[PDB]
Amino acid sequence: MPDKQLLHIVVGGELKDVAGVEFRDLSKVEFVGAYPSYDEAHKAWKAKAQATVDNAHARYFIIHAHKLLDPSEG
């Protein structure tokens, strides 16, 4: 009994540059989480970007969790 829930999980945090994806601190990489659809995670990207005004350099985006980087087989 399989059921396709696997989606593009949402990650972000504060950067060194304003537009650049160069993370200032990796403990300050705020992982937004993972929603029950990619459509829901897609909305979460801008839902965070709009929300976070107090945040200076925080550029929240998405990430591809379709395949994980295993050095075991991969």
Place this chain on the structure above:
Amino acid sequence: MPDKQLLHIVVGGELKDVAGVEFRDLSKVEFVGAYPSYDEAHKAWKAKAQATVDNAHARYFIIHAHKLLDPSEG
């Protein structure tokens, strides 16, 4: 200095299968974090996997954050 610090972040959580990437739950996807080198993040995968041998299908892998899924620029 906008130096290329960006590396592969570390994430993990339970699956519904032994080898299958069907995340059992997405709020159970423990984001291990992100380590100050790729070699550290590569080590974090096994540092977790050997710490979590008690775990049924909780496998702690890596993801390449070199490009985030931006609906903004492309």
